[PDB]
Design a protein around this ligand. Structure first.
Ligand SMILES: C[C@@H]1COCCN1c1cc([C@]2(O)C[C@H]3CC[C@@H](C2)O3)c2cnn(-c3cc[nH]n3)c2n1
Lengths: 1335, 462
């Protein structure tokens, strides 16, 4: 078996219905993972993204960890450990889940859907209470009374009873029909309801959750004025007394209804009950928590119904009903709801209610910043703690600083603040907790044990909770006797570290039973937060910590089982199980500590050395994370694998600290001490390390100004000669020659010839051994080559004598590129296909021949994607581009005849698509039909002979590169574009016409899978620029997925496909459920009733030449006020669920941050309201219309002074804190990523800025595009300038004309400047009213 | 050679390797002690004592040093009675502070004589004069400490006489190093605690801020941060200023500017005037630091920076730093503003020499940056105006009038400023002697002549 079919079957079984089948499937998927671990590690690691099956699996796994049964909940996690804690960035989670949601605020007892819900509940109670006859008879009476109140039986009619009987399931129907017609008697234990204390909650009958709930429901049913409501409440009254759940379900409706017919006194009574549930906390039972949830739900339904009733209002008595519900919803204090949700540990809902209390009721955030900070700490959203610390004017109190640091993770400052707190209030256990935790994370283990024993001497009672840290240190020190003594002390400590110490000890004493039992235990207490988190979106990343704990438990179980009686050797590939994980300290460090402890238990001979390698890995991790002091605490703990693996890591640590010289010094000391010049190291490991070290020495040299260039080139060449199969060395040498060649050749291509040859050669040799730099090496390689060919053509045209030497050098370079073509893999060229599709019009014939071999190789390998990328060059207006692409395609055909029918079919399809596209609209028609007007296209597609053409989605057009960890040889059969390929099977029958001036015709392409993909065709426009931009954005989405901060924030530049079927048309992929900012805000303003007509807007317009102060006066006096902030209302309306609301709001902040900074870097403009788009499902933003790129906007008649769009509405959505908080720190994070990945980004962009095909110069130039004698290339005159500006924006430099020299800005300061500049009214006012800066 | 705070990690590794070794346990508490972490020290040594009751006797000194710094006088008593064998400086200082708290005149003065002799002994061996004073500064700052002590304790005993020691000046007189100033400052905090005057809750924050300053200026920033924390309880704007300066040292100019702007709007709200003299001085220092940050940050416009510096000068006109940095910025802008054309630089040169001179009237901290640059600008503009007048250029007459204004400013300085302020840079003035412009030569003559009178013997040689 290929293990993919096995996994498919096994997963289907996992999600089976019968619990026993689920369990046996899980168990088989726990011996299967272990026996096929090597294959699974190949999947999750061979490519940067975990193969699709692995994503489907972990997703089927977590949802399994929600399984009710504990044994299946356990087998789920176990399989999550046997599988590894894969980096959530490797995991796709494209469609993690689609949770069902009630698509209404069900109007009342009249609604058929609420009817069906009640009938489902009553039948569930009937089946549940067949065990208890009284309750079941109550249910039968209730259900017949429901059949009565509203007809449930069609009687052959199309009446409500008809669609309702059809609405019930068949089992509910077979339960209903028997009792559907039989009368049953009610208990009729009627109650006056006077004797009961109106604040029933906390009364005797109150203390019982179901009892309080039932009593309140009865009092309400009595208050109900509506007749059908009274009937439905009376029939379920007994059931409510029997089943708390039927009550919970019906209570919101009882509320909605009584509120409608209640008098002021009745409303006040219900309000007293409700406000008593929330005001009570504990003893001043699950009752408080459950009833708090119940009242929260009642109020949420009441608000949903208020909103629906207001929709009907804008669309009388209903006005008064809406007024009643709004009144009551106002009566209750938002602050109380917030404190309650907090107490109820529902932090998201509390955040929502607090944000409303701040905005819905004008309040000063500063007085309540502390509560918000506690919430964000509990939510574990550190960006929130920071946004509060920033929005706060006052000086942070000690406790507030403690919180800020606990969120920051600064160990040093936290330690100091905790000691200060202890000085301030000595009788606090939490401060000592923080102190020992700081002494622990820093690695001061024995210091921790001594601090603990001391505080035990002072306070014995204080120890049992501090013991966890003593035992953690001990099992980290391997002081197993101390671990035993400390564990014997704590009888109830359940913390992770204590349980791990118990497991490690049981393993030390070889107590098999104890070990496996405490393992089934320490494994369940982790799966619990996962079951709780699995419900949300992006759960894997939320519950990663616990998934990492499961990976640790697996590594344990498998390293110990040989320690026992003992095949039972640990078969896990620890190095791979670690590489797969997330490139963060928080994840890899505990894993490494447990790894070294497992070793210390096995005490194998090498394990003395393996401990050193684990310490070095921990050091490298903390270094790549910035915890330099812990990296040092590790560099000390090491010393066994000191064959320069230490000296190398110490040198890197210093380099990160910035002390390049000390780093070079210590590294040369190592290279001399070990790997001495006198004896060469031929040992594979010694050789790899010697190469790493020589390369680091070369890099340091390069960074140091003193060293002469020749020594640096010599060092890099030594690397290549030592580790020639290595990507690095080759790559860095070529990169240096590229920096050195301009200086050595005084920026003259002629002398650059041979240097270019060497550079290209080594860039390609690198691409042959590894794809770590496929984005920095291939573009520069192809650019140097194509450009030298261009200069050679230029000088052979000019007739210069040097032209012949250039011809010879170009021959050499072409031979090099040909050898690369043969060696390198097709996808390595594919990742740069757009660049190659660009040079398709190169002037030099030989260069084009080689480029043609390249492009045709890529095509013969990945024809669909290529054609989709080069369909334009074939249809373009320039004859040269067309002839070049036709030549390439004919070459490919001759290589492979099969890529002939596909070619012709795709060409026909594209022709018809651009015909559809350049279609003269009939005029006033919201729709055109495919069968009427575009019939020939439907015919081409529907024909069976018609080749299979992909729906050109982004996931299918953007490759996936193999991982440097992937044995560096995977890239011979590697498969980019892994996953399901969906072909163009059919075109829907309807072709929508959009309301734009361009009149773009939306279509829907039927996929072979049967799913429907939507693809817009833009009228005349240049989508090529947008295409390569989406490529850059996919590269950015990569860099963000790998980075840990970004992915923890879930940053992502929303990306879709932009395919040009021509120079005029393209076919953009449609992201579903997206509405623009202007349409959204206009709809909301209309609902609010305040709106600005075009005439008012024209009056508010000032002359283009006007006083800035006057424009500002007008934009503040009339525009802004008429257009208040409402966006938060959009968030509240589209995402009623509090959790979903917070998720989508955070994603809005974090996605517009990404795309704002991404845009500022890209000089993005024309960010008007209709170009920004927001997803109704996830709240993410998705930009469009990337025609204005690289500060082309500042050239517009109305210059763009705003780097990106942060309007007061856009801020009001981020929350009360506004920019400060999630959005700001996300901007900082993404700018940091862009700055660290400055080089790949710049390398790919320079291929975008210099792209000849793209219409950089929009004007015709006297129909230049037709009137080019022999050229299809339009040069970008502002190329170098855009490149320089972008390199600045990335470096942190900003050009300032106020007579200042300049200095680079820190990412935080750059972000602050950007935000200030983009939200500054003085700049917004200057913007044309098209940007709708007021909105 | 203290690498950084993180020498504790090495001591702890050693402990993990040789736990019976004590020198390491000594080093650990000692590092925790230097990095504040006072209360943490007391628990460390008590834990050790529990593990090994023998080591506590030699570790008792660190449990006493922390206690009298925390002012926990009862704890000091137990940790001292436990072991009398320890004669470590910290232990003796604790004994004295206790004898003062529990007023014991005879015991205090006796132990004072004793410790004071103990500290003199290292000097007796180091008294042999080969740069001795600097070899023994550590023991001489300890005598300084004992004298501050004797003078603060004496009133607590008498009841009368009181301390006349100028605690501020006595500190600047010392070597600007943390190893020297801090022991003085911790002792000063402890003395302020022994006495309890209504201000002596605030002055403690002042001493903590001075400790932060000496640490910052001395590099190590984490102990400075701890001191800042221990300074918060006292209400101060100096706290925000120093926190910014501390961030600036870490390189985070932006976060520093942000904090400092928060502290200014909070401590110096625009509505009410800051003219409390002390409050005014702090507001001026803060606005200056703001204008200096803004100078580093590229985002900020030059006009706003100039305005901030001007506001600093207006809040503190008698202050040097304000005028100096304002003129420095004028000088940094003038080439860019004027396109490196002197004739356009005339008026900017006027403002620049003006503010330079005012700076010198009030202080000579920057005299080596100011007087030379001022004289250079003046003499150079004079050369240029003589040239353009000699060439007949168009702007020459305007150049003549601007040179007149500048010669007048230089004359006003010549009159206000002290001749010694010109003395440094006399070699420069003796250089431009052959200046071509006659009026410039007259101003230079009055300048160097005013010097000749004050210091002829040293001038006639130059
Ligand atoms: C995410 C959405 C829907 O999904 C497809 C991508 N997309 C849109 C949507 C729009 C507009 O809605 C914006 C406004 C309102 C009506 C009209 C069209 O002008 C454009 C404009 N340019 N582009 C381009 C060009 C290259 N890439 N994208 C658009 N792409």
């Amino acid at each position: 078996t290929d293990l993919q079919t096995t996994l498919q079957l096994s997963m289907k079984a996992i999600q089976h219905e019968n619990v026993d089948v689920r369990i046996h499937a899980l168990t088989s998927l726990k011996e299967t993972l272990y026996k096929n671990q090597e294959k699974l590690i190949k999947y999750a690691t061979d490519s940067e993204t975990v193969e699709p099956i692995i994503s489907q699996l972990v997703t089927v796994l977590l949802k399994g960890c929600q399984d009710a049964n504990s044994q299946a909940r356990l087998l789920c996690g176990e399989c999550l450990g046997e599988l590894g804690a894969i980096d959530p960035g490797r995991l796709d989670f494209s469609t993690t889940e689609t949770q069902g949601k009630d698509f209404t605020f069900v109007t009342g007892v009249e609604d058929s859907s609420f009817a069906y819900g009640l009938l489902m509940e009553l039948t569930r109670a009937y089946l549940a209470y067949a065990d208890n006859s009284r309750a079941q008879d109550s249910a039968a009476y209730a259900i017949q009374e429901l059949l009565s109140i509203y007809d449930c039986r069609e009687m052959e009619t199309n009446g409500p009873g008809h669609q309702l009987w059809r609405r019930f399931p068949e089992h509910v129907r077979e339960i209903l029909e028997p009792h559907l017609n039989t009368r049953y008697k009610s208990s009729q234990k009627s109650t006056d309801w006077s004797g009961v204390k109106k604040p029933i909650y906390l009364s005797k009958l109150g203390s019982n959750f179901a009892e309080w709930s039932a009593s309140w429901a009865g009092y309400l049913i009595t208050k109900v004025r509506h007749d059908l409501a009274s009937k439905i409440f009376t029939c379920c009254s007994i059931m409510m007394k029997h089943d708390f759940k039927v009550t919970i379900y019906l209570l919101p409706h009882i509320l909605v209804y009584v509120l409608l017919g209640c008098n002021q006194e009745d409303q006040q009574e219900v309000y007293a009950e409700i406000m008593a549930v929330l005001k009570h906390d504990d003893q001043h039972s699950d009752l408080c928590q459950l009833s708090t949830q119940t009242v929260f739900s009642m109020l949420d339904h009441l608000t949903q119904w208020a909103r629906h009733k207001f929709q009907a209002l804008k669309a009388t008595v209903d006005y008064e009903d809406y007024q009643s519900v709004t009144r009551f919803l106002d009566l209750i204090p938002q602050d109380t709801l917030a404190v309650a949700s907090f107490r109820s540990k529902a932090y998201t809902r509390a955040v929502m209610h607090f944000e409303s209390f701040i905005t819905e009721k004008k309040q000063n955030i500063q007085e309540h910043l502390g509560f918000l900070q506690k919430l964000y700490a509990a939510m574990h959203e550190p960006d929130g703690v920071a946004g509060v610390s920033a929005i706060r004017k006052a000086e942070p109190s000690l406790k507030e600083q403690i919180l800020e640091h606990e969120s920051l993770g600064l160990l040093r400052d936290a330690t100091a603040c905790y000691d200060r707190a202890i000085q301030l209030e000595p009788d606090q256990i939490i401060h000592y907790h923080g102190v020992v935790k700081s002494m622990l994370g820093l690695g001061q283990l024995s210091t921790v044990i001594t601090q603990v024993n001391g505080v035990h001497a002072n306070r014995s009672e204080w120890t049992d909770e501090l013991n966890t840290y003593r035992v953690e240190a001990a099992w980290k020190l391997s002081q197993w006797d101390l671990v035993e003594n400390y564990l014997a002390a704590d009888g109830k400590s359940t913390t992770w570290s204590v349980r791990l110490g118990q497991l490690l000890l049981s393993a030390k004493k070889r107590d098999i039973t104890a070990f496996y039992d405490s393992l089934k235990l320490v494994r369940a207490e982790q799966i619990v937060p996962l079951s709780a988190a699995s419900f949300e979106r992006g759960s894997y990343q939320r519950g990663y910590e616990y998934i990492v704990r499961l990976h640790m438990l697996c590594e344990l179980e498998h390293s110990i089982k040989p320690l026992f009686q003992h095949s039972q050797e640990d078969s896990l590939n620890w190095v791979a199980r670690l590489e797969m994980t997330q490139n963060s300290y928080r994840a890899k460090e505990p894993i490494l500590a447990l790894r070294r402890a497992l070793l210390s238990l096995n005490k194998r001979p090498d394990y003395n050395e393996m401990v050193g390698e684990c310490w070095l890995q921990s050091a490298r991790v903390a270094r790549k994370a910035g915890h330099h002091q812990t990296a040092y605490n590790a560099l000390l703990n090491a010393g066994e694998s000191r064959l320069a693996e230490l000296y190398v890591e110490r040198a890197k640590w210093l380099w990160s600290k910035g002390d390049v010289h000390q780093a070079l010094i210590v590294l040369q000391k190592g290279v001399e001490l070990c790997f001495p010049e006198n004896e060469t190291p031929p040992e594979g490991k010694n050789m790899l390390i010697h190469g790493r070290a020589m390369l680091l020495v070369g890099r340091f040299m390069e960074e140091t100004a003193n060293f002469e260039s020749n020594a640096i080139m010599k060092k890099y060449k030594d690397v290549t000669a030592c580790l020639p199969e290595w990507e690095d060395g080759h790559f860095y040498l070529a990169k240096y020659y590229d920096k050195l060649m301009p200086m050595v050749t005084d920026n003259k291509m002629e002398k650059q010839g041979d240097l270019i040859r060497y550079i290209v050669l080594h860039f390609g040799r690198s691409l042959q051994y590894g794809n770590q730099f496929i984005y920095q090496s291939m573009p520069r390689m192809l650019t140097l080559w194509l450009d030298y060919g261009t200069k050679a053509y230029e000088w052979e045209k000019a007739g210069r004598s040097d032209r012949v030497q250039m011809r010879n050098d170009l021959g050499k370079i072409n031979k090099v590129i040909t050898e690369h073509t043969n060696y390198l893999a097709p996808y390595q060229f594919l990742t740069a296909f757009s660049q190659l599709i660009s040079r398709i019009c190169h002037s030099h014939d030989e260069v084009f021949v080689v480029l043609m071999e390249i492009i045709a190789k890529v095509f013969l390998a990945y024809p669909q994607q290529a054609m989709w990328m080069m369909t334009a060059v074939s249809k373009s207006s320039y004859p040269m581009r067309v002839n070049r692409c036709k030549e390439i395609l004919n070459k490919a055909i001759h290589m492979k005849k099969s890529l002939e029918k596909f070619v012709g079919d795709a060409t026909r399809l594209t022709d018809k698509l651009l015909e559809l596209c350049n279609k003269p609209v009939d005029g006033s028609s919201s729709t055109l039909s495919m069968s009427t007007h575009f019939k020939m296209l439907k015919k081409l597609v529907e024909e069976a002979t018609f080749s299979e053409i992909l729906i050109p989605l982004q996931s299918v057009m953007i490759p996936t590169l193999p991982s440097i960890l992937g044995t560096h040889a995977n890239h011979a059969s590697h498969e980019p574009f892994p996953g399901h390929w969906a072909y163009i099977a059919g075109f829907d029958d309807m072709v929508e016409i959009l309301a734009s001036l361009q009149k773009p015709k939306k279509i829907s392409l039927k996929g072979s899978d049967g799913k429907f993909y939507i693809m817009m065709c833009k009228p005349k426009d240049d989508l090529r620029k947008d295409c390569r931009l989406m490529e850059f954005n996919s590269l950015i989405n990569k860099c963000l997925r790998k980075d840990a901060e970004s992915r923890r924030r879930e940053l992502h530049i929303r990306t879709y496909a932009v395919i040009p079927l021509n120079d005029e048309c393209g076919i953009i992929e449609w992201v579903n459920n997206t509405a623009g900012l202007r349409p959204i805000l206009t709809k909301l303003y209309k609902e609010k009733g305040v709106y600005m007509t075009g005439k008012e807007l024209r009056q508010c317009m000032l002359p283009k030449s006007a006083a800035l102060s006057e424009k500002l006066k007008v934009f503040r006096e009339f525009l802004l006020p008429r257009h208040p902030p409402i966006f938060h209302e959009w968030f509240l309306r589209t995402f009623p669920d509090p959790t979903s609301w917070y998720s989508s709001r955070s994603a809005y902040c974090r996605s517009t941050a990404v795309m704002s900074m991404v845009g500022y870097i890209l000089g993005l403009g024309d960010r008007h309201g209709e170009n920004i788009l927001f997803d109704s499902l996830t709240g993410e933003c998705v930009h469009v219309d990337f025609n204005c790129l690289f500060n082309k906007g500042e050239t517009f008649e109305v210059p763009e002074i705003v780097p990106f769009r942060l309007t007061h509405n856009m801020v009001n959505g981020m929350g009360p804190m506004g920019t400060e908080g999630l959005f700001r720190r996300a901007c900082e994070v993404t700018m940091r990523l862009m700055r660290d990945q400055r080089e790949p980004l710049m390398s790919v962009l320079k291929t975008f800025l210099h792209d000849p095909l793209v219409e950089w110069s929009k004007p015709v130039k006297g129909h230049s595009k037709a009137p080019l004698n022999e050229t299809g290339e339009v040069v970008n005159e502002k190329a170098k300038t855009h490149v320089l500006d972008i390199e600045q924006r990335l470096q942190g430099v900003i050009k300032t004309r106020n007579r200042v020299t300049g200095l680079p800005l820190s990412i935080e300061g750059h972000v602050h400047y950007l935000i200030q500049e983009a939200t500054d009214e003085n700049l917004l006012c200057q913007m044309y009213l098209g940007w709708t800066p007021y909105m």
